[PDB]
Every structure is written in structure tokens, then in C-alpha cells.
């Protein structure tokens, strides 16, 4: 019965419109790995399924980093005559390794958003015929999708609401002193352009 | 004999520009916790010495949530009826749960970054007298010693680069069509404004 | 007793305007190897406080690169049944191993400087107020804590002098016919420029 | 006697014009493959050979991640206690161990220009001397050692020959309403142009 | 039978464009070192050959160099009263230490293009009936051949670009505010000259 | 504990104005020598600290010269049966011949600021800016930290107090008839003169 | 071997800009207590070397107070049958007795700064040239340096950013309606007013 296969395309779903590494796709493979209890080949399985191959490449480098440290530290808990990690987290009854190699793998892929020198979010503009609400709440959420958990949008939002804005609204934020004010001043300056 | 006091000294004045979670804050502290394999009454004086109590406060709540979801997920590896973990990891046998508190410890402040809603490179912005070249390393070096380690800096700069940029720098970034541009394209723009 | 913590801030402190790779970096760093004489998890420590965790990654790809290459040549000396060599290299009585796993470690940074495709010396600008002497100082300088050893500086500079100086001083070495000379007809022609 | 000294070299003069990962190149080494069945060790010759430092680190990064799957998957037949792949695979008598190996190495060079980020066939343009048959023979030429086996070249080069024309073709391909039309009308359109 | 003086013949051939200790030239004699598995006389006779009196001289100096500091660290594993590294490399069944004599034998070229003073490429100029792609080529193709691996090629070239051009083009790339930029706006401003 | 990493970065720092083979760089390294009784092999680590490859390479070839004719001088007085030089002064109960090297290795450096056709202190001109005095103490300081020892300051400092003074000084000097008078006459009479 | 001599020097060396008894001042004196354990004689040692003879005074005073609050409750542990709090205090096998003297002379200090009714950073007032950024720093500093933890100065500073401001800037600050606003607001408001 390949229930896991239904589970698979819902978990690709649930990370559909979600950047690899995003607090979304990091809550629902957090969860899908607690919940499936998944193998070191399992977990190419997924991988594989949810990421393009540059990503998963990507993965597999920071990932072999982080498991390169781990193991020269000596903190792993893997025996060095019982062979390679990734034979040993397939392995029946060695279930704190298999945990401790899943927790790795999930801590990789909160380094790819950082790495990532061209996001999306980066490019997102102000159109010409959209309100400057509409255009901070597209912001917000592509900030949402796009920064790792654990950064400080809010300076961020403030500054790319002034710098990705309409060159009218540019104008009138200079005009009004609003060039990187608090995101409700920013607006209710803004409240006075329409396109 | 304090020899630790002498390097506590020396800690705090490598991580003095340094924010608390930022990674030359972070280099640090993690090295020092290496190097001297701390008690946890030994991180509460370094927390104290190195941090006020608001931010002290600020990483013992951190630290508790962190401390609740290891207990609660039974991977502390600490025995229930061998009383708290904080009291636990300054026993002297205990080796490897005086190290899963260490890891906690520092854990906790790479979120303090990230929590903080208006921090000081958010406020810095391009004198009447001061260059444009200037006031670019003066953000990157603000950004490098408050931003947490995995946050993408290069957008974040290619935005502040315009947004706290001085008025007239403004003005040329817009004239020549660089309002979020690449750092080359920002510069050699800028190198034609003189205070 | 920490005394590695000691000699570990004081490496920083010295190699702390050096870029990872660069002649006094590797001076450094190669006399830190030869005193202290670390295992791999040792040399770990070393690359975490010195380096980003970027490229700590960088840096962990080139040398599994090196490693890969002795290990299918069999010139390591490793017993490939006796585990990885991130772990041998960790061995308390196997010191030949660990000399060889330390020269494969530090000849994983020469290649850094030459992998990096934008440096930061190859940024540096002759100011509006600034001298042209000053200039390629400032230039010699950066070269020196930029370029890997055993690079022709002396041909880049002179190109460099040229190439990213003031305008006016550009104008001067094309009207006397010095476009690539050596430095000091280059400085003899633009010291009769003045800010 | 040095007798692969010579097919080596051979092999360089065959593939001098073929790009890393081309058909050609492909073609050429995988008939050296399977001429000489060569070992890991030899694999890393043949590889320095042909390949820059940087390309065979790329290659390594593909390799191993490849390699990653297939230890984890188990596909590839390897005892996980009896060493590496890359000790193995120059163990005498482990004959289906090294053919694996050589086909993941061969496979691993596939992906090289797809994973690449600045082809130089793209950046192939017309001259302004140059007739518009003999540019578009340059463009086939450079897409034949320059694309990766199962790419439709067909689409890209119709979209090429208008997209890397020169102005004076590129004016009389929009008047005679071929902007992207298939081969024999786009040169029987710019037969009418002489340099 | 002389199979040695073919090959020999086939790598001075292959070897006439490249400089003695560039990338091209590099991996043809480390492949030839490791098909021939040469002793200390025949890579005096491979020197020799392949290379002019002054260079084998500064070969000689370089490796003595390099040959001192390995004999004084005692790294090289030789006994030091069975004679010399230069007799004992020629001893039929000390394998491992003509292994060790050819590595510093090849280790020793590395430093000829670093070490140089006045290389060709740098005086490698833009001709006046010459087009400005065609001397990027050139220029690429000299430092292919010129510099030693390991050197930031690509900062160089832009740099050279400029310094190197004719000057009604340095003219053109000062009058469109382009002294040193990435190398595709340099040969976009300069499609604009034709010789 | 590693006491020499401590006092090698304290040398390095003191020694830092000073060139190879000046004065101060050698009462340095005399006193270094005769307070750590160091070895060939710490030698080797002192002088590759302390310089760059390029120099300790020139230095090797000095001091080969200096070991060539001791040896064959055969006033050493080390057994030619018993191994190079190089080895012996290694050898832990072998003081006398370590003391003998010590001295041949520090007296190998005072030949490096002779054997320089275009030394530093030779391109130091004065500013236009840049008042007499401060220029004749700037010269002194660099023949000072430039020189070897034993060499006549004196006579080439008032001849330098001409040749590289501003062209107004010189023509102050030629004036009230001071072409290369005692430097109290120079700057008696540049005194006068002001930028 | 008086190892308390170097870090008593220390100490004041890195308190010398903090007042008696502020958070910076307060985290050094309860570090140094918490490493050296010290008896009452040596507070009185570490007292005398870091306050004047009237601040040392003012500290027995406030001292004596909580020594005789402590004495009358009968909460500090000791035998008055025993002798003096001053003598049980340098009694080695009253460890118990010797932390709560040390607590109780830490807690003294806390209340100095409160005490004060003419403190350094009430004093501190803009200069005619110096910019409204440069004294908002001036006394954030002066303020943390002087007043003591856990005290709000963000009311503070945002009333002395008017008070002790300019009177050209007070008039801009009042003719903008910003005589007590937020930080960023008085900023904005006097970014206006160049000197």
C-alpha cells in the first residue's frame, strides 16, 4: 500500500508556492520527518521528490559540512568501524543515529536562504497600476516565503517599501520625510497616491 | 589561581562592536565554550559579564523554550527524578549533558538577532559630509556585526544602500535608474555626488 | 588551563585584515600548526573562529576535494578498514597521519584567494582628495593581504595603477604616454597632479 | 612501457574543442573507459588530465553527491565495512564495484553544463564584417560541443539566430516579420544583407 | 628500445604554447610523472629537454629551496647517512622516496610564474588594425598559458582590458564611464569601434 | 604549552618596520636566537614567519654560500660521515654544531639589504605637502630601518636630503650654494622654504 | 606570586571610564568577586584601588546601613559570640558567611549612583559645532556609564535630547512640535540643522 506516496504529493502541496529552507517548508518536513520516522535513503526519497537537483546539491554539500564537523568533532555517536553514516542511518535498531541524522538533514536547509545571493523577494517591485497596501502586503509575504525564521523583517520591510516602491511614491515619501519611516507612516502617506 | 578571568576580559573585548547572536559575538563564545568546557553556573557569570539584564532575561526566556522542547521531547538525556537540568549540567561526572546544556546555551542567542525589532544598524544612515563609499562599508561592517549568521546581506545592502543613502544621493540613484541595483552599479553612480 | 584560547585570539588579532588564503594568513596559521601540532577537530575550531560558516563550507569542499584525490591515489597512509579519515586524524598515537591530514588542510586555502570571482582589492579606487602615491599604496597593500603567494604581483599592480585611478591622473598617463609602466615613471608622471 | 601515455594524449587532442560534459567529449571518454577499465586512481588522472582544478572539484561535488544516493539507496553492491568507494574501486578483484564507479563518474559529467551558469555559445554574436550563413554555422558548431546529450537544440538555435544578429540583421529580420522562423527562412531573409 | 623518446618529443610538442609552471603545462608533466614513474636522472633529462638553461637553473635553485626546508624538517623520510636525496631517487627498490623527490620536483615549477619579474602576457597590447574581442582572446589565451594555477584570472583580464587596449578605445571606455567594469559592458562599449 | 608561539608573534611585531637583515630586525633575532637555542628545523619556522617565501628562498641561496665555503673550508666541525649539515644541527646532543649553524644563519642575512638593486628607501621622495625636517627625519627612519649595519649613513643621507627633496627645495639648496653640504647647513637653509 | 596585582590592574583599566557603582563598573566588581572569592581584607584592598577616599567612605556608610539592617534581622549566619562581621569575614572555614559579606558589599555599590545629587551625565550638554547625532551618543553613553541598571533611560535620554541640546536646535525642535518624541523623530526633526 504506498500510503507514504499520498503523504508525499500532500507535504509537496503544503511546500508548493514555499523557497527551500522557508519557515513553511521547514514546518512541514520538521513534521513529516517526526511523523514518518524516515531512513537516510528515505530522506533522499523526499528530498528528491520536494527539491530541483541544484537544490538538492546544495543541500548535499551543506549537509556534508555539517556532517564532516560532527564527525571530526567525534560528537555524532557513530562508531568508526561500523561503516559510513549514510549505510549506518539505514541500519534496523540504531535509532538515535538515524534521529541524530535527521536532525542534521533538516538543519542544512536553513543555510540555503542565506546562501542565496538572488532571491526573489529581492526583485519584487511596485507595479503601475497597484496600491501601495497591496504592493506592502506582496512584500510581507514574500518575505514570509523567502527569509529564513529568525530574521528581522521589519527593518528589512520598512527599507524595501521605500527602495522597490513606484518612482511617484518615492517622490512623495521623499516630499512627505517618509524615506524610512515606520511601515503605518509609510502608508499613510501613500494613502494620498493612487495610480 | 583565575585564569578564566583573564580570558573572560579578553572575550569581551574581542565581542565589544559585536551584538549579542552576531557571528563575531558567536565565533567567540562558541571557541570559549569549546575552551573551557563551562559549568552552567559558569555560562550564567558569562552571560552576566558579557550581556545586561535585559538581554540576559531576553536569552533565559529563549533558552527556557529551547531547554521546554528538549525536555518535553525526552532527547536532553537527563533523568527526571535527578533533578533540573540546571543543576544537573554543574555535576562533575556528567560530561555529555553538561555539553547538551553548552549547546542550548548557545543556541539560544542566535535567535536574539533576530527578535530584535529595531536594532542599530537600522538606524544608520549617510552624513551631509560622509561619501557614498564610506557610508557602504560603514553598513556593511554595522550588518556583519548585527545581522545573525544565514541571513542574506547582499539583498538587505543593495536596499540600504539606496534607502539610507543622504537626499541627493537619492536623487542621483533615481536620475540614473538605480533605486535597487547592483553594489558596482550603486558606487559608480555615487562617485559622482561630492558633499 | 585554556592556553589554546589565548594563542587562538591572538592568531585572529593578527590575521584579522588578511583574507583566508593570503601570505600572512598562511604564515600564521602554518607556525600555528607547527606549535600546537592539532587534530582534526582541533584544526575545526581553528577554521570556525577564523572563518564564516560559508567559507568554513568552502573551505570543507576544496579539501574533501584534496583528500578525495589521496585517498584514491593511496598515498595517505590511512587503513581504509579503520574508518574516515576525519576520524584517524583524531587518533592519539598516530602523528604521521595527523602531519599529513594538516598539510592537506592548509593547502586547501591557497586555492580560496583563486576561486573568489569579486575580491575586495579589485574595488580599490584612487579618491577625488587623495593623492596618487597614497593610491597605490593603498593598492600594494591590498594586494598583499589579497593575493595567494607565488603571484605576479608586480604586473598587476602597474595595470591595477592605472586601471582603477582618478580620471584626471588617467588623462595625464595617456598624455604623456605611461597607459603601463613601470610604478615609479607612473608616480613621476602623476605627481604632477595635485587634488 | 607507457603505452596509455599516448591514448591520453590522444584523448586531449580529440576533445580540445569539445566542452566538459559535451557529447564529443563524452563519446571520446566513455570509449576510454571502456578500453581501459580504468581504477579510481587512473579515473583521477584522466580527470586532472582533460580538467582544470575548479572543473574537477565541480565534477567531485556532482560525484559525490551521486555517490551519496547510490551508498544510501544501496543500489551500487559495495560491503559498508570493507573501506570507501574510492579504495575499493582500485581493489583488484572487486570488478562490478569499479564498473559502477566508472559509470557514476561518467554520469556526474552530464550535469556539468546544464549546473553551469555562463555558457560560452550564448555569448557568441555575429560580426560586423561577418556574412549571416557562416554566423549561424558558428552558433551550430559552438551548441554541438557546447550543449549536453537530449538538449533540443533545434528551438535555441532558430531563437539564437535572431537574438545574437547583428543590428543591420536583425532590422531586416523584424521587416521581413522573422523574428524567431525556422533556419532556411531566417538565411533566406538575410541573404539580401552584405557586409 | 627508446618508447621514452616519442613521449618525450609528443610533451615538448604538446607543451610550446605554455609557460614553464602554467596549468596547461602543470597537468602534462604531472600526468608524464606519474605514466613514466621517472628517476632523479631521467627528470634531469625531462628538465632539461623541455626547458631552457636559466629556467632549469632557476628550477634548480627553487627546488634546492624546497628540498632544504623538507630535509630539515626531516619530513621526507630518507636516512641521512645512505646519502644523498639526489643519489638515493635513482635506488631502484625506494620507491616511496622518488615518489617523495618527484613531488618536490613538481612542486618547485609552481613557484616560475610567481617568481617572474617580466612574463609575455604583460606586454600583450591591442594592435592598431586589431578589433578589441579579439584581443580579450588574446589576452585570455596568455594568461591561460602565463599565469600559475590558483590566480584570480578574472579580475586580471578586466583589469588588462583596459590597461592593454588601444587608446581610442581607453578613451571610449573613460568617456562611457566604463575604466573597469565586468567584462561583458566592456566589449558592449567597445562593439561601438571598429579599427 | 606552546611558550615560542607567544614571543614568534611578539618578534614578528616588533620586527615590523624593520627590513630583512636591518639593524633592529637583527638585534631582534640575534637576542631571539640566543634566548630560544633553536634548532635547523625551528629555524626553518623562525625564517618562514618572518618572511615571505621569496625571501627565505633568497636567503637559502645566501646561506648556501656561506655553508659552501665552511664546508669546504672544513672549518665547521661536523663529521662528513655523519650526515649533512642540515640534519645535524638537528641532532639533541649536538650543541656546539647547532650554536655553529645559529651563527651562519643569522650571518646569512646582513648580505640581503646588499644584494637589493631597488631597496625601498631609495623611492622615498619628499611631499608637496610635506614640510623639510619632516621629510629628513622620514629618510633617516627608512635608511635606519633599511640599511644593513656598518654601513655610512652619514654621507648618504645628505646626499639623499638633496636628490629626493622637492624640486623648490632643490632649487633653495642650489641657490645659497648647499648642493651636498652637512644636513644642520640643509635644513638652516630649507627652513625658509614652506609648502 | 601576586597574581591579583595584574587582574586589579585590569580591572581598573576597564572600569576607568564607569562610574562607581554603574552596570559595566558593577559586572567587572561581581566578576572579579565571583573569581577570586576574596575576604573582607581584600575588598577593602580592591575598594582602596579602584574609589577615592570619599567614595570609599560613602561605600562603608551605605554598607554599614545593610550590615546593620542584615545584623538586626539576624539573617547574615554569623555567631556574635564569634566575633566581628569585618574579622568573620577573612575567617577561611566560614565560606557560607564569607559569600554573604560579599554579597552585601556588591549590593552597597548598587545604590551609590542614586545617592549621587550632582551625577556626570546631567551635566553633558551639545556643543556649538558638535551635531545632535554625536550628542545623542555622547549621552546614551554618559547614561549607561553612570546611571545605574535597571533604570529607564529611554525617557530619560528623549528628555535630555531637548534639554541639554542646542538652543538653535531646541528653537527648530519646538517650531517642529517635537519638545519630548521618540529618538528617531527628534533625529529626523534635526538632521535639518547643520552647524
Known amino acids: 500500500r ?13 511546500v508548493s508556492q514555499a523557497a527551500p529552507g522557508s519557515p513553511q517548508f521547514m514546518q512541514t518536513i520538521r513534521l513529516a520527518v517526526q511523523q514518518f520516522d524516515p531512513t537516510a535513503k528515505d530522506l533522499q526519497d523526499l528530498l528528491q521528490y520536494l527539491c530541483s537537483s541544484l537544490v538538492a546539491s546544495l543541500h548535499h ?41 535527521q536532525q542534521l538533514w533538516l538543519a542544512a536547509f536553513a ?9 526573489s523577494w529581492a526583485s519584487i517591485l511596485q507595479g503601475l497600476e497597484e496600491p501601495y497596501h497591496a504592493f506592502v502586503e506582496r512584500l510581507n509575504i514574500a518575505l514570509d516565503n523567502g ?49
Do not use: F
Open 2 to 14: 504506498p500510503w507514504q506516496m499520498k503523504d508525499l504529493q500532500a507535504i509537496k502541496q503544503e
Open 61 to 101: 554539500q551543506q549537509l556534508d559540512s555539517l556532517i564532516s564537523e560532527a564527525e571530526t568533532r567525534g560528537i555524532t555517536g557513530y562508531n568508526p568501524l561500523a561503516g559510513p553514516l549514510r549505510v549506518q542511518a539505514n541500519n534496523p535498531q540504531q535509532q538515535g543515529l538515524r534521529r541524530e541524522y
Open 111 to 119: 543555510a540555503l536562504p542565506g546562501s542565496a545571493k538572488d532571491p
Open 147 to 195: 527569509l529564513p525564521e529568525g530574521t528581522p523583517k521589519d527593518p528589512i520591510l520598512r527599507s524595501l517599501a521605500y527602495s522597490n516602491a513606484n518612482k511617484e511614491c518615492q517622490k512623495l515619501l521623499q516630499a512627505r520625510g517618509h524615506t524610512n519611516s515606520p511601515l503605518g507612516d509609510m502608508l499613510r502617506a501613500c494613502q494620498t497616491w493612487t495610480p
